Amino acid sequence: MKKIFMMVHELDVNKGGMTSSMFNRSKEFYDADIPADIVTFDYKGNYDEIIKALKKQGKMDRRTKMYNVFEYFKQISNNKHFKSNKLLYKHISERLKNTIEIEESKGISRYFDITTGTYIAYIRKSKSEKVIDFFKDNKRIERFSFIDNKVHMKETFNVDNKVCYQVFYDEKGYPYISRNINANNGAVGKTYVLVNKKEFKNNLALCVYYLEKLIKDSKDSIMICDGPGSFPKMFNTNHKNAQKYGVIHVNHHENFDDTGAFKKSEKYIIENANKINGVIVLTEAQRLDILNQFDVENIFTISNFVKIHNAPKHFQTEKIVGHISRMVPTKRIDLLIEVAELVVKKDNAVKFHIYGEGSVKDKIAKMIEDKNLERNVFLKGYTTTPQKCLEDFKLVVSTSQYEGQGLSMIEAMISKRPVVAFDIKYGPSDFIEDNKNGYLIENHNINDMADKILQLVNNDVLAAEFGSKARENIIEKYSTESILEKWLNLFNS
Amino acid sequence: MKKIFMMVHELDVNKGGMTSSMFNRSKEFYDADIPADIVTFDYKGNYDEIIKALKKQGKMDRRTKMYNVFEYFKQISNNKHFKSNKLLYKHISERLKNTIEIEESKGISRYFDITTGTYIAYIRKSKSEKVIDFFKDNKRIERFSFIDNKVHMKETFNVDNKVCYQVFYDEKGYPYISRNINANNGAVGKTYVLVNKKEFKNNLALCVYYLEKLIKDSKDSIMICDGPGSFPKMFNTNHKNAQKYGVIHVNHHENFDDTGAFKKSEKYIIENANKINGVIVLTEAQRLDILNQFDVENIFTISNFVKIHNAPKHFQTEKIVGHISRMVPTKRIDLLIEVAELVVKKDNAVKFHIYGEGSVKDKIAKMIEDKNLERNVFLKGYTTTPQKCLEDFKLVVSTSQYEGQGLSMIEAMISKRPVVAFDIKYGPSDFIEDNKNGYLIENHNINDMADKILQLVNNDVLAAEFGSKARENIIEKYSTESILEKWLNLFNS
Amino acid sequence: MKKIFMMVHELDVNKGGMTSSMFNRSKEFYDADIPADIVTFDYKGNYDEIIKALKKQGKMDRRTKMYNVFEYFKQISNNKHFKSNKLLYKHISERLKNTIEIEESKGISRYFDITTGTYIAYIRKSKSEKVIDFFKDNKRIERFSFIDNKVHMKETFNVDNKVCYQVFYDEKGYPYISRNINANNGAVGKTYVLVNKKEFKNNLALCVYYLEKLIKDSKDSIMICDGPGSFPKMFNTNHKNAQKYGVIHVNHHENFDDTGAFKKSEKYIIENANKINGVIVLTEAQRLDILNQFDVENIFTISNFVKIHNAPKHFQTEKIVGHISRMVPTKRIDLLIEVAELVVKKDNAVKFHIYGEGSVKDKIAKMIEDKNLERNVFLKGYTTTPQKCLEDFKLVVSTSQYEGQGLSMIEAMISKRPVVAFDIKYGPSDFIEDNKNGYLIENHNINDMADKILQLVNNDVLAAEFGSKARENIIEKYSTESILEKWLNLFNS
């Protein structure tokens, strides 16, 4: 009779990392007969289309449900009214009355008052979505947003033409919620639930009320909070029986901080660990780190569930070294190019395939040019099928300075590909057996890493032996049955 | 048949100092059969309530009338219309038409358009006063202000939500005046007397016209201008027979200026003294100072009238030293703490009671902590009954660097309390007889002042003898009959 | 069958220099039976009144026509409608409905809402033109501009009360064009031809379309572009047969630039000379300069036509030295005062008459005071009859550092007045024969110029001989028949 609620601010088709885990964690719990659903706290006029696509693409399980604060009230409003809000559509159409249309593109058209030449409206049609912008004294003041010719949301714009206020509409066109938006930072202020004629300080206020309405105050109701920003939404509920857990997915220490600083959102979760049921960390290393620095004891280690897909038909014999990750400073791809340069000198043959995109994509691209490794290092860009990429690698390398567990390397080892990576906080140390299933390089030692890639990339015997021992290892440690038992013990306690 | 008009920009229940004098000066002239009324130049929707309270509290005489520029036209408008301005209240109510109410507090409620969710209005009810704020494109643009459910004033707000324009309404809701307000500084620009369909450059322009309409151009009409900011309102009238006098209530030299600078407003009055009937100064010291530095001769000394209330039943035998004044830099309470420290060392017994509030209240409070005089110096805060406080003092001390006359010390001497104060510009020198009725300490000599407080606070014989000689002195010099004769001589001349 | 179109952004009664030339160039071509008309690209509600006046004053030839982009569409709109746009005038009058009028001056009146006291409108009547400003939340938002009580243009104002959008109306009050105005710089953005329901990126876009509609793509259609800013309006047309020429009227090198920089607008014309029919320069000196610095060869020298008016009845015998020019830095009037000082020392008699106005008028006025030449140097201000001024001069002096040809000095020589000027780029060298018809002073040599003015101003024989030889010379070189033949050769080629 247990029921899990996993919290994250939003869900999207592009969005990854944490969501991927949550999606899979939901499959496992649903398989274990504990419905584990996702709760989001954002507005999306097309959430149905997003979820429908996520499930079609097989990223999200068919069983997994997504609860959303704004949809919750939208349903109350849908049930409350019976005829369409004809007066709203009449208001919109009346505004566009004695006007002349000046087409700019296909969908794009502008509307000017025939009697005065005043600029009235801008309209942009686009398959299913239509946008109507209303002007006043030559400045856009409003934006009516339609999906399938039915309005779902209206926005008011300030002097700097920036959203200062939102209004969401139900399936009949009636307004159910409105809210002030800080134009500068985009922060959500006073939220007005027009359907219930109730005011809320901020969105947090609203979601706290919502979670109290959604989740039954039973010891059987479990709240796992993945998204660290969503933590106080959970933490602030009046629930006295329902269980509250928080999951830390990243190394809690502020990245590139010799001062010993902590990540704001994470620090807050860790600090309150005794005030809730528990704080879940992925590695046992992180658990001890937290217990040492903080005067709190409700910290627990529960690894991510691991998807044990079938290993490729055959090993890669060619000297191809791979890496699949987001292009961000924490991943230190800058160091990867420095190792790549050291490797290609001692052996010209070996090629490096770097999949991914982000901020540092440009810096790394220019870095290859200067180091003259254009014929060896190839930035293969974004990938949608990363499992198919793994088939083509002899070994996977990771320069990452900061990690939570490094599931990416774990996922590589299942595909019988050995990992040569820097021993960092946190993860590699747990699953990489140095000189057995891959190489656990001492941090920053680019010369040692270069030597070990050359060793492994040249011997086809080692690459196959270390790769097979890598999969055998993950299967042993990361047993899905046991990780589930770990959770159950924690819930039933 | 003489009639006096005393000018000050505004009147209020909190307001003090000058107003107190004006109020009492009005009693004396009314007693002498010369009606002396107050003329104000500010908008207050509740002026009746203010005056009613001032007179109930006995601060303002029952006979004293208050003439006000905005009330003057309001009466013309009241007399001009016969039915209520129904169309205005209809306009306001129509704005609040198809709306939904979202209560925040008791009086506070918000109004949103049922068809569109637009934020329409904010309403805050509060016993007699109601406020309606109207919004446009999520920003407040207008504020209708009601008293007893009848609108009296409307305000328009700029982009930074600041008053840029006012409209006052009469007893029927009709507009009689409107005016532009500089949003930055709050300055009043173009004033439009809608009742008379007349435009005015500034408020000065308007009040000048008003004073010409109010005051008869007879030699029997006397204008005393107390408020220095109101001076040009008087000075600029076309009156050829009516008398124009200006009163300087403070030391005309810019405070804390070694350069020998003059106070803008005051300098202007002094400079024009020959162009008007006269400039009245409180002390004979100030009179000579002005005559020396300025090439003008219409300066006269006429002290403040003094209220000779009954002295307390008995003297204070306990070592309690007092001070009742506003907490401002000119009063130099910082020096008072330095004298208090010097005194408490030589005699632990003596306690200091400092009544009053202002800007330097915080600095002085922190100053007592550091000097460790918490058990001796007590900041008794604001007082409403200062005469009752005087009963509890053995002697009154004053560190004030700048004064106009120092009526506060005079008022203390009437209550048979000797004054130990710094000899400054202007006042003490006239009424304090050193080593006879109090101590006239050489300025900044905190060591001499400390020694004299100790002398007086210890000898109960001296404290009673000097205190009695203090009252005997004020009664002699500050004879109410003679001060009145001084004025009469000036008017009849 | 040839037809010329001369381009300049605008035409006005005050405007001079280039326009004067264009006007005269049009007379000559009309006289030679080639209609040469002016094409402008600006809005003026009273263009008719301007042209009517230009032609009355005899500045513009009666035959010369002025084509204007905005008038072009206005005519299409005039022809399209049959009844007056009654609804617009109804809209304006309805806005001014229940209002009270507060007169400020004669034409100036303000309108306030009788029910609420709201500031509605500002109206300023002025003989033929009327202006109505509409306010909203106490701020002007719109300005209806009338000529003979018929509205021609409306303007929308931003938060800083600055024009952000224009709407022009036809002879019936109907809107035909509207356009966005960048409030900061005053730049014209998106132009909407409401009559044709067509959008245009910028004004350039619009005028390019217009020129294509106006000018027939025949080899007989000639486009001369005088105004350098109007160049791309011409340059960007799709015309494959019509001739495109550009005229440079000034020294193309950026003034006061030791770096060897070029004037943006001019550089662009010169750079594209091979892409068009030709680039016309006034002097042969400038032609070579351009051909040297730029890898282009379509540069041609065609002087300005010269108006050979009758020389005065008699020479000026008095020691009067003149100068008629705009007060700008390029003219270097600062140097003229330095020469004037050097001259008046060696001979007190000689007086300097400096006609003109501009920016440096103030600096030069203060410069005469310091140098103490008040009794010799007289700034005669702006002149409307410059030919009558020439009668009163013995000799004309020019300190100008930068010139295009210096027609002003040529015009002086026709009036038999010798020119003593600095040899600069470009012009003087062509028409001044040193020690024959005037003096061609080596640049900056103020001492040599001083000596030559003294020589000439003293000898009445020389002043008459050099002056007569000056006119004889201009007549020879600047033959109107030959300049016309030069153009014809270029067109017919």
GROMACS .gro file of C-alpha atoms in nm, chain C residues 55-262:
model
  208
 1041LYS     CA    1   1.029   7.917  -5.594
 1042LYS     CA    2   0.886   8.258  -5.484
 1043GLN     CA    3   1.224   8.353  -5.328
 1044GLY     CA    4   1.379   8.250  -5.663
 1045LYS     CA    5   1.609   7.994  -5.494
 1046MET     CA    6   1.445   7.705  -5.688
 1047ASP     CA    7   1.349   7.719  -6.059
 1048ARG     CA    8   0.975   7.728  -6.148
 1049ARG     CA    9   1.024   7.424  -6.381
 1050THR     CA   10   1.208   7.207  -6.122
 1051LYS     CA   11   0.974   6.946  -5.968
 1052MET     CA   12   1.022   6.777  -5.633
 1053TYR     CA   13   0.938   6.409  -5.606
 1054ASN     CA   14   0.882   6.281  -5.254
 1055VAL     CA   15   0.836   5.919  -5.134
 1056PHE     CA   16   0.565   6.002  -4.875
 1057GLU     CA   17   0.378   6.230  -5.115
 1058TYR     CA   18   0.384   5.946  -5.369
 1059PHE     CA   19   0.177   5.718  -5.150
 1060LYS     CA   20  -0.031   6.002  -5.018
 1061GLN     CA   21  -0.149   6.055  -5.375
 1062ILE     CA   22  -0.239   5.684  -5.417
 1063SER     CA   23  -0.447   5.710  -5.092
 1064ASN     CA   24  -0.610   6.035  -5.211
 1065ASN     CA   25  -0.724   5.864  -5.529
 1066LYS     CA   26  -0.841   5.555  -5.338
 1067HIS     CA   27  -1.091   5.726  -5.105
 1068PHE     CA   28  -1.397   5.944  -5.185
 1069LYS     CA   29  -1.553   6.066  -4.853
 1070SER     CA   30  -1.363   6.224  -4.564
 1071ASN     CA   31  -1.241   5.995  -4.280
 1072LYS     CA   32  -1.520   6.124  -4.053
 1073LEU     CA   33  -1.456   5.848  -3.798
 1074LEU     CA   34  -1.108   5.984  -3.718
 1075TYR     CA   35  -1.226   6.339  -3.645
 1076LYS     CA   36  -1.513   6.183  -3.445
 1077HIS     CA   37  -1.256   5.980  -3.239
 1078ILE     CA   38  -1.053   6.298  -3.166
 1079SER     CA   39  -1.361   6.503  -3.070
 1080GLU     CA   40  -1.506   6.221  -2.855
 1081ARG     CA   41  -1.179   6.220  -2.651
 1082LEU     CA   42  -1.237   6.589  -2.570
 1083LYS     CA   43  -1.600   6.521  -2.457
 1084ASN     CA   44  -1.697   6.612  -2.097
 1085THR     CA   45  -1.398   6.842  -2.037
 1086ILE     CA   46  -1.324   7.186  -1.890
 1087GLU     CA   47  -1.093   7.431  -2.074
 1088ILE     CA   48  -0.812   7.610  -1.893
 1089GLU     CA   49  -0.652   7.875  -2.121
 1090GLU     CA   50  -0.282   7.941  -2.060
 1091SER     CA   51  -0.198   8.178  -2.349
 1092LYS     CA   52  -0.378   8.275  -2.676
 1093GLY     CA   53  -0.364   7.947  -2.874
 1094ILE     CA   54  -0.262   7.732  -2.574
 1095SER     CA   55  -0.554   7.568  -2.378
 1096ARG     CA   56  -0.575   7.257  -2.157
 1097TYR     CA   57  -0.860   7.012  -2.125
 1098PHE     CA   58  -0.954   6.833  -1.801
 1099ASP     CA   59  -1.229   6.576  -1.745
 1100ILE     CA   60  -1.524   6.743  -1.563
 1101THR     CA   61  -1.626   6.424  -1.383
 1102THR     CA   62  -1.273   6.327  -1.256
 1103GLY     CA   63  -1.029   6.613  -1.302
 1104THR     CA   64  -0.814   6.400  -1.525
 1105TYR     CA   65  -0.573   6.583  -1.756
 1106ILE     CA   66  -0.710   6.500  -2.105
 1107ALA     CA   67  -0.549   6.719  -2.368
 1108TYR     CA   68  -0.318   7.006  -2.457
 1109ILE     CA   69  -0.413   7.215  -2.763
 1110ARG     CA   70  -0.192   7.485  -2.930
 1111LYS     CA   71  -0.345   7.676  -3.225
 1112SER     CA   72  -0.111   7.882  -3.448
 1113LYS     CA   73  -0.263   8.049  -3.762
 1114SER     CA   74  -0.279   7.745  -3.995
 1115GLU     CA   75  -0.122   7.470  -3.778
 1116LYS     CA   76  -0.298   7.320  -3.474
 1117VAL     CA   77  -0.153   7.064  -3.235
 1118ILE     CA   78  -0.351   6.825  -3.009
 1119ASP     CA   79  -0.159   6.630  -2.743
 1120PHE     CA   80  -0.339   6.346  -2.566
 1121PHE     CA   81  -0.240   6.235  -2.218
 1122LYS     CA   82  -0.279   5.909  -2.029
 1123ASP     CA   83  -0.197   5.870  -1.659
 1124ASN     CA   84  -0.070   6.233  -1.676
 1125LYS     CA   85   0.174   6.162  -1.958
 1126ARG     CA   86   0.152   6.269  -2.327
 1127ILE     CA   87   0.106   5.960  -2.546
 1128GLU     CA   88  -0.012   6.108  -2.875
 1129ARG     CA   89   0.016   6.416  -3.097
 1130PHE     CA   90  -0.233   6.494  -3.372
 1131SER     CA   91  -0.086   6.762  -3.606
 1132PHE     CA   92  -0.325   6.962  -3.827
 1133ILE     CA   93  -0.273   7.206  -4.119
 1134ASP     CA   94  -0.579   7.416  -4.208
 1135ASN     CA   95  -0.782   7.217  -3.949
 1136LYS     CA   96  -0.726   6.892  -4.143
 1137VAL     CA   97  -0.507   6.628  -3.968
 1138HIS     CA   98  -0.194   6.517  -4.158
 1139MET     CA   99   0.013   6.335  -3.902
 1140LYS     CA  100  -0.014   6.159  -3.566
 1141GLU     CA  101   0.280   6.070  -3.329
 1142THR     CA  102   0.305   5.822  -3.039
 1143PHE     CA  103   0.539   5.900  -2.745
 1144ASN     CA  104   0.739   5.666  -2.520
 1145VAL     CA  105   0.800   5.681  -2.139
 1146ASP     CA  106   1.066   5.948  -2.185
 1147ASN     CA  107   0.803   6.143  -2.390
 1148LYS     CA  108   0.990   6.075  -2.719
 1149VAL     CA  109   0.848   5.983  -3.067
 1150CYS     CA  110   0.850   5.607  -3.106
 1151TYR     CA  111   0.594   5.585  -3.393
 1152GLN     CA  112   0.448   5.795  -3.679
 1153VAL     CA  113   0.130   5.776  -3.893
 1154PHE     CA  114   0.081   5.999  -4.194
 1155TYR     CA  115  -0.274   6.081  -4.326
 1156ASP     CA  116  -0.387   6.179  -4.678
 1157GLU     CA  117  -0.614   6.469  -4.791
 1158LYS     CA  118  -0.924   6.288  -4.653
 1159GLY     CA  119  -0.774   6.195  -4.316
 1160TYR     CA  120  -0.711   5.828  -4.403
 1161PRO     CA  121  -0.382   5.666  -4.288
 1162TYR     CA  122  -0.154   5.556  -4.572
 1163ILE     CA  123   0.181   5.501  -4.400
 1164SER     CA  124   0.298   5.434  -4.046
 1165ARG     CA  125   0.650   5.370  -3.912
 1166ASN     CA  126   0.845   5.290  -3.602
 1167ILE     CA  127   1.092   5.556  -3.481
 1168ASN     CA  128   1.390   5.462  -3.259
 1169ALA     CA  129   1.328   5.707  -2.972
 1170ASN     CA  130   1.699   5.734  -2.880
 1171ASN     CA  131   1.863   5.817  -3.219
 1172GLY     CA  132   1.551   5.911  -3.415
 1173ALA     CA  133   1.616   5.634  -3.674
 1174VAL     CA  134   1.324   5.516  -3.896
 1175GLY     CA  135   1.258   5.142  -3.862
 1176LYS     CA  136   0.977   4.923  -4.004
 1177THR     CA  137   0.775   5.128  -4.249
 1178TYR     CA  138   0.420   5.012  -4.316
 1179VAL     CA  139   0.251   5.130  -4.638
 1180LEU     CA  140  -0.103   5.076  -4.508
 1181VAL     CA  141  -0.246   5.190  -4.846
 1182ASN     CA  142  -0.071   4.892  -5.026
 1183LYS     CA  143  -0.070   4.669  -4.710
 1184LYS     CA  144   0.312   4.634  -4.754
 1185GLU     CA  145   0.591   4.618  -4.495
 1186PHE     CA  146   0.941   4.767  -4.535
 1187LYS     CA  147   1.251   4.699  -4.318
 1188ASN     CA  148   1.369   5.058  -4.306
 1189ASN     CA  149   1.310   5.379  -4.500
 1190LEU     CA  150   1.594   5.279  -4.739
 1191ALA     CA  151   1.387   4.964  -4.820
 1192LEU     CA  152   1.085   5.184  -4.891
 1193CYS     CA  153   1.269   5.451  -5.104
 1194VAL     CA  154   1.443   5.171  -5.301
 1195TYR     CA  155   1.097   5.029  -5.387
 1196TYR     CA  156   0.980   5.387  -5.460
 1197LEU     CA  157   1.267   5.474  -5.694
 1198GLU     CA  158   1.196   5.154  -5.885
 1199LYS     CA  159   0.829   5.268  -5.914
 1200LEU     CA  160   0.918   5.631  -6.003
 1201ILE     CA  161   1.215   5.595  -6.243
 1202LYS     CA  162   1.162   5.403  -6.575
 1203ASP     CA  163   1.440   5.141  -6.635
 1204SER     CA  164   1.550   5.311  -6.955
 1205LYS     CA  165   1.900   5.415  -7.054
 1206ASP     CA  166   1.739   5.765  -7.090
 1207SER     CA  167   1.661   5.779  -6.715
 1208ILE     CA  168   1.953   5.935  -6.522
 1209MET     CA  169   1.996   5.932  -6.143
 1210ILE     CA  170   2.233   6.181  -5.996
 1211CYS     CA  171   2.283   6.136  -5.628
 1212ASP     CA  172   2.398   6.454  -5.452
 1213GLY     CA  173   2.311   6.379  -5.091
 1214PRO     CA  174   2.571   6.116  -4.979
 1215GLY     CA  175   2.328   5.968  -4.724
 1216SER     CA  176   2.077   5.905  -5.004
 1217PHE     CA  177   2.340   5.711  -5.207
 1218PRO     CA  178   2.236   5.352  -5.107
 1219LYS     CA  179   1.869   5.448  -5.180
 1220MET     CA  180   1.989   5.490  -5.543
 1221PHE     CA  181   2.264   5.224  -5.540
 1222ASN     CA  182   2.030   4.945  -5.421
 1223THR     CA  183   1.765   4.972  -5.698
 1224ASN     CA  184   1.720   4.681  -5.942
 1225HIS     CA  185   1.755   4.920  -6.246
 1226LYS     CA  186   1.959   4.752  -6.524
 1227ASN     CA  187   1.938   5.028  -6.793
 1228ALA     CA  188   1.888   5.352  -6.595
 1229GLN     CA  189   2.212   5.543  -6.524
 1230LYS     CA  190   2.346   5.590  -6.171
 1231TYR     CA  191   2.587   5.870  -6.083
 1232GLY     CA  192   2.714   5.998  -5.748
 1233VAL     CA  193   2.841   6.351  -5.681
 1234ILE     CA  194   3.104   6.428  -5.417
 1235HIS     CA  195   3.068   6.791  -5.304
 1236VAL     CA  196   3.338   6.788  -5.031
 1237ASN     CA  197   3.705   6.686  -4.970
 1238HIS     CA  198   3.653   6.306  -4.905
 1239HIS     CA  199   3.930   6.296  -4.636
 1240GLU     CA  200   3.796   6.312  -4.276
 1241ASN     CA  201   3.852   6.671  -4.155
 1242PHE     CA  202   4.136   6.720  -3.900
 1243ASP     CA  203   4.276   6.364  -3.948
 1244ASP     CA  204   4.659   6.319  -3.968
 1245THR     CA  205   4.587   5.939  -3.991
 1246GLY     CA  206   4.464   5.963  -4.354
 1247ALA     CA  207   4.100   5.872  -4.281
 1248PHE     CA  208   3.800   5.902  -4.520
   0.00000   0.00000   0.00000
